RNA sequence: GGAAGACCGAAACAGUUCUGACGUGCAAAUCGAUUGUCAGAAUUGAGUAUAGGGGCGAAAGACCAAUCGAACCAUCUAGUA
RNA sequence: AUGAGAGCCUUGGAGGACUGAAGUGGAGAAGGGUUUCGUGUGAACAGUGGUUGAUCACGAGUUAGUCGGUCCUAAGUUCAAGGCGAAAGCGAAAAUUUUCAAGUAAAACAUAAUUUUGAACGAAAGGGAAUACGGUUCCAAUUCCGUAACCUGUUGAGUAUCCGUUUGUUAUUAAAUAUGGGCCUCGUGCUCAUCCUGGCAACAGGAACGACCAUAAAGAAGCCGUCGAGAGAUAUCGGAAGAGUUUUCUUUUCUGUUUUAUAGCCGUACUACCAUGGAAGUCUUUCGCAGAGAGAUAUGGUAGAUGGGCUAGAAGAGCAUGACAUAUACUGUUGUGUCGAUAUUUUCUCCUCGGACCUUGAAAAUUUAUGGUGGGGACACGCAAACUUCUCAACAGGCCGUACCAAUAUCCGCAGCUGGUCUCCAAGGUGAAGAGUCUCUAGUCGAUAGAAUAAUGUAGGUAAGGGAAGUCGGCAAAUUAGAUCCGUAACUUCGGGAUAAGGAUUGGCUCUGAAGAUUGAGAUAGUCGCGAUUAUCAAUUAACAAUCAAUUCAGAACUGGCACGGACUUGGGGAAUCCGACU
RNA sequence: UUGAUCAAAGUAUCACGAGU
């Protein structure tokens, strides 16, 4: 084995310092530095992940263009597709039931 | 669990067989595999012998 | 096979508090710890989040009831009471 | 260090022109008793703290 | 490099620009790789025939100063 | 966390404003998720609706209650515990309620009151068995530590 | 199957015995073998918080910068004897 | 070899050893403050010396849009005086201080529902825009040079976007992201219209009204365990190329074979959803019990890819090796870089499901989506547009830290003090093991040196016979110890006691047996010309026949001071009393 | 019944007109 010197100057465990270990071309095992998991949003009330969408950092999400952070449908990337499905056929029959009752 | 998913996906053992075959094998009763390949050349045989 | 005699769920806790003192929380051990039968979904799933709370996995509800039971024998009177007394006063 | 302030680096400029020996024509001038740097500090023999 | 392409005029179109500084050329024993040097990237057509490659070499930008390895 | 009875979630919508007016109460025993709570005067009485002491008949038992005529709910909190409601008066408007210490109070009859016997008891009744689960207990409530007895 | 202020033990943290070393030391408390714990009422850094008839204390009048049955510093003060 | 003088460290070659990956190794935090690195050198200092030096003298040296600060808020500092106090000032989670607001291109006749707290600090380990490789110095390097990227900001140029029809074109068509419609003499006439489209669905594509109010989400997470994926390592067996060894024998024993960011594309495991469908004779499935009429198993698909495979990077990049060749400089050049496989949280990372709990496990910055009324975009014979959430291009990125030590000699302990002082990487062997002994890579032999081996010592051994007689007291020492199999008492809170006790076994050598994986094997009839070419199933079928891999477990012969846990590592045991329950 | 709501519709009278 080589073993490793670090690269930045915090030598402590965190998550700030995440870190794997690469042959580079010269073949001399280097630390790459590994960044924060990206995650897919969450639903209104399933509080599941959304289909559909790819992961992200939030500094990351400037930099994407729509369909990579939403869906296509109403309430697209943030509620699922069963609750919205929910949520229609809520709102419509609740609706339609204040006409039967106010007559 | 794997030569049962080969006996079931062949054909050689029916389903019935494996929701009384999985629960022997969780549950110790088969040494190795040698055996559970002798309770397929005889507990089959006589579903055959009674049909 | 029966792996104890006695003790059962407080063998974890084993020859330390006392007998009389691990008879009585293994009443408390067994009830919590416990699937009890979902009201809503009808599936027995519905184990305790914390104390206090309850939460049935499929079909994700979540009813606050006893710290180790789910409903206890003083809240279920007066579930029941409250419902006498209201029949009385509305009519 | 190598995490030092600017005022820590600027102070610690200053400390290391004033560890000087005495120019050595001082030494010469008519009336000038001065025999060595008498104030020199010195890295593991007096801190600085100050 | 991060970028290649593989349409022919791609290559040719990338070559007419307003960027685009110098073309670099490598020859393989297998292929022969043709590199332009761009502005944000770097774009990379390889060829493997080796008769449209001369082909291709003009086909050329005249002003576009060619980058040459044997 | 320090707390001994669940605590629930509830919003309601702004009256007066757009807002979606999200509210902590402590949760009367038998409140899923999904349930709608309705506190006001013209409230029913079924758990855990809030609804003052005047509109709730006697022998009811409520919790959360309020002391003082407005004031948000301070008497009968913890979990287990309740107040029944033992008697009335349309004289000055008057109601005596019984609290968990067994004295008996006389509160007025407008303060509001939540109906029900909260979640999360009887918690007292299973030993906490070992000293680091006593030091579990109060590393979320305060330095009442291990009190050393002042005799030594 | 894999619970537990459960077990033996490494790193660590502690300090039982030798009343071993040492005892104008290597050291104003260390060296050596022997021991105690080791998944927790665990061990640690950094930022904070509490200030002297005060603090903090699982309590020994322990600790609060080698200082504690009352810190340290300057003064009253060249106290009085 | 120096040098006046060498046991040092002075150096260089042989060299025998130690640390032994939980190092006497390589780097950082705090601290230090120039100790750093070259050239010199007398005294002093280096408790011996000294040509050397962390000393002395003189010259040098720390390069950032990407690493950090800086930015955010935590506990807290509490900080407009409404207040209080003779003042200074204040054990101030203020709780009252007109707007005590943070505010908005918002209309009139104090913009409108609105916000109670002002204001600021506080983390080189938490939150957070983005960079990595090959080279280079006596001294610096993610900072310089080389080459390939990126983020933030401002700006520019292309990019749904021209219709029926008919300008191209007889029409079919074609610019045109789509037209139609009646009428009419067809229509040339009239009129009508683009804020894109697909997929049943999960969702999909190059973009496709944020300017607000509102809601949801991400940021945003502990602990312990955990099937599986890959990385890195180490490891056999194969190619190659060069070293090692030749008492004798060894197709040997060894080194080396590599591919960073960033991208493009394939992509499948895994989990969850979608469609068809309807489940008892209940089936699915895990190491683990998880599911299912609230839709199972099945068949097809969608989502996520964290996972790799390709290919760009990749100049035989460069690198590394090994041939050459060139008095030689900045050298020209040949040739290689290739297969398979086994293994562990000896280690990270991803994913899955769990577990404990009177414990239930940060906030804000910043970001994103969607919902909403009103407002803008919005002609079709087009010209276009597009804070366009697409693509491309210009330009810019300030301030401050950056050397070195990190300790048996740069720090603190008055000192070159055996003490102390937070982390990261981690080889082979035997073994359960980051143990203990030995070794490889790097690193040292520096602890004042020679002679000699008296007494007393500090430290370690052994000792006839007896075995505690010694002693306050078995203090100290001695014994036992790993592993497999047998076996186990009083008492008990039924959990334990318990490794109770008490026994047996173990090396070496040559064998035998058991435990798995991928392929199934594939009868049968004929063609072409044994070659080539074309398929069903009764049974098969246990290491079926091949091929491949694992190291554990059970035996059996033979065998030697019968010394076998041969070092190491490593409980003496039992009967009681008294105290504290236990950690 | 785990939907939704903000920012006036209508109405009347005047501005009842401006551009035209």
């Known amino acids: 084995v080589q073993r490793l010197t670090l690269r930045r100057r915090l030598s402590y465990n965190t ?29 209104g009330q399933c ?30 990337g943030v509620l699922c597709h069963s609750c919205l499905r929910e949520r229609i056929v809520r709102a419509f029959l609740i609706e339609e039931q204040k006409i039967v009752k106010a007559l | 669990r794997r030569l049962l998913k080969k006996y079931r996906d062949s054909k050689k053992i029916d389903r019935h067989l494996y929701h009384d075959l999985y629960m022997k094998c969780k549950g110790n009763v088969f040494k190795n595999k040698r055996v559970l390949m002798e309770y397929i050349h005889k507990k089959k045989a006589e579903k055959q012998r009674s049909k | 096979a029966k792996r104890t005699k006695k003790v059962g769920i407080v063998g974890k806790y084993g020859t330390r508090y006392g007998a009389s003192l691990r008879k009585m929380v293994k009443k408390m051990e067994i009830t919590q710890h416990s699937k009890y039968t979902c009201s ?20 994700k509800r979540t009813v606050a009831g006893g710290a180790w039971v789910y409903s206890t024998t003083a809240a279920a009177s007066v579930r029941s009471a409250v419902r006498r007394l209201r029949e009385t006063k509305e009519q | 260090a190598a995490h030092k302030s600017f005022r820590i680096k600027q102070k610690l400029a200053k400390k290391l022109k004033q560890n000087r020996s005495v120019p050595q ?6 009336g000038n008793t001065i025999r060595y740097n008498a104030k020199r500090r010195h890295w593991r023999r007096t801190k600085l703290k100050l | 490099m991060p970028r290649e392409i593989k349409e022919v005029k791609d290559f040719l179109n990338k ?56 | 966390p320090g707390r001994g009875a669940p605590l629930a979630v509830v919003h309601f919508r702004d ?51 309020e002391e003082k005529t407005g004031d948000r709910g301070r008497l ?4 287990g515990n309740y107040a029944t409601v033992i008697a009335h008066n349309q004289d000055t408007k008057k109601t005596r309620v019984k609290l968990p210490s067994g004295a008996k109070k006389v509160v007025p009859s407008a303060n509001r009151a939540m109906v029900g016997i909260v979640a999360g008891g009887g918690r007292i009744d299973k030993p906490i068995l070992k000293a680091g689960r006593a030091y579990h207990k109060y590393k979320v409530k305060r330095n009442s530590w291990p009190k050393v007895r002042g005799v030594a």
């Open chain 1, 47 to 76: 509080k599941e992940k959304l289909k559909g969408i790819t992961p992200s950092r939030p500094s990351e999400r400037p930099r994407m263009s729509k369909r990579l952070k939403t869906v296509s449908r109403t309430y697209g």
């Open chain 1, 15 to 43: 998550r700030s310092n995440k870190r794997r270990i690469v042959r580079t071309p010269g073949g001399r095992l280097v630390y790459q530095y590994v960044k924060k998991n990206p995650t897919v949003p969450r639903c």
């Open chain 6, 76 to 79: 009968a909190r913890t979990s």
């Open chain 6, 15 to 65: 009256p007066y404003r757009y807002k979606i007016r999200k509210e902590l109460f402590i949760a009367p025993e038998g409140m899923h998720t999904g349930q709608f709570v309705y506190c006001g005067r013209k409230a029913t009485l079924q758990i855990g609706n809030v609804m003052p002491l005047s509109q709730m008949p006697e022998g009811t038992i409520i919790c959360n209650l």
């Open chain 3, 40 to 59: 809503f979904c009808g599936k027995d799933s519905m184990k305790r989040a914390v104390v206090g709370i309850w939460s049935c996995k499929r079909c």
């Open chain 5, 15 to 70: 070559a007419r620009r307003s960027d685009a500084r110098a073309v670099k050329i490598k020859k393989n024993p297998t292929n022969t790789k043709f590199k332009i040097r761009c502005s944000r990237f770097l774009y990379t057509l390889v060829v493997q025939d080796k008769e449209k490659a001369d082909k291709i070499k003009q086909s050329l930008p005249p002003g576009l100063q060619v980058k040459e390895v044997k």
């Open chain 4, 25 to 30: 024509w001082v030494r010469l001038r008519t």
